[PDB]
Amino acid sequence: RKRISNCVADYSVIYNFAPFFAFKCYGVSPTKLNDLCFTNVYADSFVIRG
Amino acid sequence: SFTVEKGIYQTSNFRVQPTESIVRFPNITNLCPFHEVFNATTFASVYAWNRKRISNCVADYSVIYNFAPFFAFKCYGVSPTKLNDLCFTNVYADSFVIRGNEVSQIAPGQTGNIADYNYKLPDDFTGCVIAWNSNKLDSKPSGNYNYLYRLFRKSKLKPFERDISTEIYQAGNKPCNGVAGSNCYSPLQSYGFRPTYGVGHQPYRVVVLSFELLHAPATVCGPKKSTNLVKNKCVNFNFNGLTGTGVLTESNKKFLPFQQFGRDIADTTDAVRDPQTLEILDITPCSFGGVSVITPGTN
Amino acid sequence: VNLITRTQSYTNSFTRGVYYPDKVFRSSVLHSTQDLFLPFFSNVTWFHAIHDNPALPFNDGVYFASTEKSNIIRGWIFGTTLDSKTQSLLIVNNATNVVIKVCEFQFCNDPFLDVESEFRVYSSANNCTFEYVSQPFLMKNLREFVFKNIDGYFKIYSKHTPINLERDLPQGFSALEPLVDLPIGINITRFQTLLALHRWTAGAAAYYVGYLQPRTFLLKYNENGTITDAVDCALDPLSETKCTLK
Amino acid sequence: NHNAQALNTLVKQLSSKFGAISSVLNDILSRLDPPEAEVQIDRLITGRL
Amino acid sequence: NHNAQALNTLVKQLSSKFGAISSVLNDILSRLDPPEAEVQIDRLITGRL
Numbered sequence: 273r274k275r276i277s278n279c280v281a282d283y284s285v286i287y288n289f290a291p292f293f294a295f296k297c298y299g300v301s302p303t304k305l306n307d308l309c310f311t312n313v314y315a316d317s318f319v320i321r322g
Numbered sequence: 323s324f325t326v327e328k329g330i331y332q333t334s335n336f337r338v339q340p341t342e343s344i345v346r347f348p349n350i351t352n353l354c355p356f357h358e359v360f361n362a363t364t365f366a367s368v369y370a371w372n373r374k375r376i377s378n379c380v381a382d383y384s385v386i387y388n389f390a391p392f393f394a395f396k397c398y399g400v401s402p403t404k405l406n407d408l409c410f411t412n413v414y415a416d417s418f419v420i421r422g423n424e425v426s427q428i429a430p431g432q433t434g435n436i437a438d439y440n441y442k443l444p445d446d447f448t449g450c451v452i453a454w455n456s457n458k459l460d461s462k463p464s465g466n467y468n469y470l471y472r473l474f475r476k477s478k479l480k481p482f483e484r485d486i487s488t489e490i491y492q493a494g495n496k497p498c499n500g501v502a503g504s505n506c507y508s509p510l511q512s513y514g515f516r517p518t519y520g521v522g523h524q525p526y527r528v529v530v531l532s533f534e535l536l537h538a539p540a541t542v543c544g545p546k547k548s549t550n551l552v553k554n555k556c557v558n559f560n561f562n563g564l565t566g567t568g569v570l571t572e573s574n575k576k577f578l579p580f581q582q583f584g585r586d587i588a589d590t591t592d593a594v595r596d597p598q599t600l601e602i603l604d605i606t607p608c609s610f611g612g613v614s615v616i617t618p619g620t621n
Numbered sequence: 622v623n624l625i626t627r628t629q630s631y632t633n634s635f636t637r638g639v640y641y642p643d644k645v646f647r648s649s650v651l652h653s654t655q656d657l658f659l660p661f662f663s664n665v666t667w668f669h670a671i672h673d674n675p676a677l678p679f680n681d682g683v684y685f686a687s688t689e690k691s692n693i694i695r696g697w698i699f700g701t702t703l704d705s706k707t708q709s710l711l712i713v714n715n716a717t718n719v720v721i722k723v724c725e726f727q728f729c730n731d732p733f734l735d736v737e738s739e740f741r742v743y744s745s746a747n748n749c750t751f752e753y754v755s756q757p758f759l760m761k762n763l764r765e766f767v768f769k770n771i772d773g774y775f776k777i778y779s780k781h782t783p784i785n786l787e788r789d790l791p792q793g794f795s796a797l798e799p800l801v802d803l804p805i806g807i808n809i810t811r812f813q814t815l816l817a818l819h820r821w822t823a824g825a826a827a828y829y830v831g832y833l834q835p836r837t838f839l840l841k842y843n844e845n846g847t848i849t850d851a852v853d854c855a856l857d858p859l860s861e862t863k864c865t866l867k
Numbered sequence: 868n869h870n871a872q873a874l875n876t877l878v879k880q881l882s883s884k885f886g887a888i889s890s891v892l893n894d895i896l897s898r899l900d901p902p903e904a905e906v907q908i909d910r911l912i913t914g915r916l
Numbered sequence: 917n918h919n920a921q922a923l924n925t926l927v928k929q930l931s932s933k934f935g936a937i938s939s940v941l942n943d944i945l946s947r948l949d950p951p952e953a954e955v956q957i958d959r960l961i962t963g964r965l
């Protein structure tokens with residue numbers, strides 16, 4: 273678990289880092305992420321089965 | 323209840339039932355050339371996308387599955403299984419090649435580089451989108467460089483608007499003067515396609531089909547046989563996909579030559595023009611009414 | 622070559638520029654529509670051309686009126702820079718056909734026809750896709766035209782009416798009927814007017830130009846299905862009251 | 868006047884969409900897949916009720 | 917008392933969600949994709965009607 277705070281977030285560059293197909297967001301839309309402003313961001317990473 | 327008191331009661335309504343069915347379709351014998359759209363062995367860049375017009379032909383969509391190895395359709399205003407019954411005025415086919423992770427941008431109300439600088443869809447789109455992987459054809463071991471996309475633009479594009487101009491984008495106050503110096507760029511980047519990338523970075527071929535609803539005489543629709551025309555009877559009718567039941571009679575209305583339908587206060591069709599013979603007909607509901615039962619007590 | 626000069630005047634449109642909004646038959650009803658219309662009692666510019674920057678703005682749409690007979694007028698040009706770096710329209714009319722092309726023409730400052738080569742209109746056109754050929758539009762008389770484009774679709778309406786001896790626009794109502802809709806799909810900012818010059822010889826022309834705006838109208842259909850009366854809902858409080866009461 | 872106005876309003880109400888794609892049932896039935904047509908028919912039914 | 921209570925209840929009713937994600941239109945418009953915002957706006961419209 274990694275905490276992200278006190279920075280400018282540009283989500284459109286995330287597409288250049290991993291060969292995923294599409295996002296899966298629940299409370300918001302992927303195309304509107306560049307306008308909203310949050311308090312803290314958390315990133316969790318792991319490996320599972322298909 | 324099993325017992326009824328003395329009085330008069332309203333039970334139900336009576337209606338006359340239709341006798342037969344009537345189908346009226348225009349005189350079309352050609353076949354729509356969907357084969358030429360697929361397997362064209364050459365697809366244009368996204369920034370300069372081809373557009374083909376399809377009109378005056380019989381459209382059989384079920385054969386499209388035999389032309390490209392796509393998985394499924396993605397339609398918005400209609401359903402893929404009902405395409406063989408509707409009748410349109412014009413069809414438009416657009417084709418291009420994009421990256422794997424940009425396919426989600428070809429949809430109404432989307433945002434992104436491709437959506438606002440290369441290809442834009444209206445918020446009231448009615449049509450279908452087909453996309454399939456083309457890694458075996460558009461990838462090279464050294465890296466393909468024949469596909470390009472626009473990166474910078476002053477203002478967002480409008481729906482169904484294409485841009486071809488090649489200039490030097492200026493990001494500063496000083497004029498570019500035709501040289502790609504500081505704060506001056508070339509707004510045309512090139513995809514680098516290799517066969518060893520992930521699925522999200524592999525090329526994809528995209529074809530968009532756009533339909534026009536009935537406002538003018540129809541020209542494109544599927545193989546439906548046309549029967550005779552009967553009048554003065556309660557019958558089911560189907561005029562160019564407009565279905566209903568009623569009685570068809572001669573019309574005294576003076577339709578203008580560019581008009582095809584007639585509406586009433588409740589906004590339902592009451593006058594129609596026959597597709598084969600340019601004749602006006604009036605539609606009336608079949609006979610109906612209410613029934614009441616008068617009885618003394620069951621005692 | 623530059624050989625044309627222009628003069629301007631202003632006049633009143635009264636109630637002109639009403640067209641059928643759709644190809645649907647109606648009768649003996651009052652209908653409400655929201656579309657691009659020419660507002661009632663608005664400025665309209667009277668242009669006199671005698672033999673010049675006729676690159677007038679296009680804005681949302683254009684209403685054109687002509688009361689001449691010599692057939693000196695024909696065709697139009699549309700674009701955003703009128704140069705070879707951007708595609709442009711080349712609607713051209715003659716006695717037998719109309720040809721519409723969307724190419725990257727290198728237009729001249731003062732285009733016209735030699736009469737019958739367009740060598741004075743554009744130097745050359747190289748890359749383009751859209752071409753179309755049909756029957757010409759133009760056929761004591763007043764000709765009214767409406768041009769617009771929405772969602773990459775270029776739409777044209779027209780009407781021809783008989784007029785008596787009058788120095789201004791007439792009084793009454795005359796509806797317009799659609800002719801042509803095309804998939805243009807380009808950016809339009811300015812437009813242009815084309816004339817034919819015989820050899821040259823002195824020439825004179827005059828026309829009326831107005832601009833459309835998004836408005837709400839209340840139209841009245843008679844028992845025969847024709848539009849005979851209309852109310853603009855944003856002209857004065859009385860018209861707003863009439864629109865609210867329908 | 869009141870009775871006529873009420874009946875005319877009730878008749879005029881039949882041309883509303885209520886958030887659906889069309890106000891005509893036949894168009895929805897002929898343009899849409901059968902399990903997907905109920906979500907459009909329900910809106911019209913609720914509005915008319 | 918009755919008139920004041922009715923008006924106060926009507927004003928207070930504006931803070932309900934009616935099954936949507938928020939009771940503020942601006943938040944829905946700024947947080948959601950345009951074709952997906954109608955399904956949330958409709959609930960608020962119906963409740964207020």
Ligand SMILES: *[C@@H]1O[C@H](CO)[C@@H](O)[C@H](O)[C@H]1NC(C)=O
Pocket residue numbers: 288289290
């Ligand atoms: C970062 O991720 C990209 C994914 O395309 C990869 O090519 C690159 O080698 C990575 N860099 C490091 C330092 O891991």
Ligand SMILES: *[C@@H]1O[C@H](CO)[C@@H](O)[C@H](O)[C@H]1NC(C)=O
Pocket residue numbers: 360361362363388389390
């Ligand atoms: C047409 O597409 C099919 C797809 O299965 C392909 O096998 C065939 O070779 C193509 N024909 C031409 C002429 O491109």
Ligand SMILES: *[C@@H]1O[C@H](CO)[C@@H](O)[C@H](O)[C@H]1NC(C)=O
Pocket residue numbers: 476477478479480701808809810
């Ligand atoms: C169209 O051309 C005008 C004129 O320069 C320009 O301002 C505008 O950004 C262009 N694009 C659109 C979508 O209007």
Ligand SMILES: *[C@@H]1O[C@H](CO)[C@@H](O)[C@H](O)[C@H]1NC(C)=O
Pocket residue numbers: 349597598599
């Ligand atoms: C359609 O075909 C039938 C039979 O060939 C003919 O009688 C009819 O006139 C045709 N109508 C048109 C509009 O071509």
Ligand SMILES: *[C@@H]1O[C@H](CO)[C@@H](O)[C@H](O)[C@H]1NC(C)=O
Pocket residue numbers: 631632633634663664665
């Ligand atoms: C036309 O415009 C002029 C000024 O440009 C204005 O004075 C006049 O009232 C307008 N309307 C007319 C002449 O009907």
Ligand SMILES: *[C@@H]1O[C@H](CO)[C@@H](O)[C@H](O)[C@H]1NC(C)=O
Pocket residue numbers: 715716717718719720
């Ligand atoms: C009018 O223009 C068309 C298109 O160039 C041409 O075919 C036709 O011959 C012209 N009319 C005359 C009378 O030359």
Ligand SMILES: *[C@@H]1O[C@H](CO)[C@@H](O)[C@H](O)[C@H]1NC(C)=O
Pocket residue numbers: 488747748
């Ligand atoms: C067409 O466009 C290309 C690329 O912009 C340009 O090099 C060429 O000169 C243009 N004209 C022709 C006839 O190819």
Ligand SMILES: *[C@@H]1O[C@H](CO)[C@@H](O)[C@H](O)[C@H]1NC(C)=O
Pocket residue numbers: 843844845
């Ligand atoms: C309506 O049309 C009929 C038939 O042509 C004609 O006799 C009558 O005068 C017309 N009435 C109006 C108001 O146009």
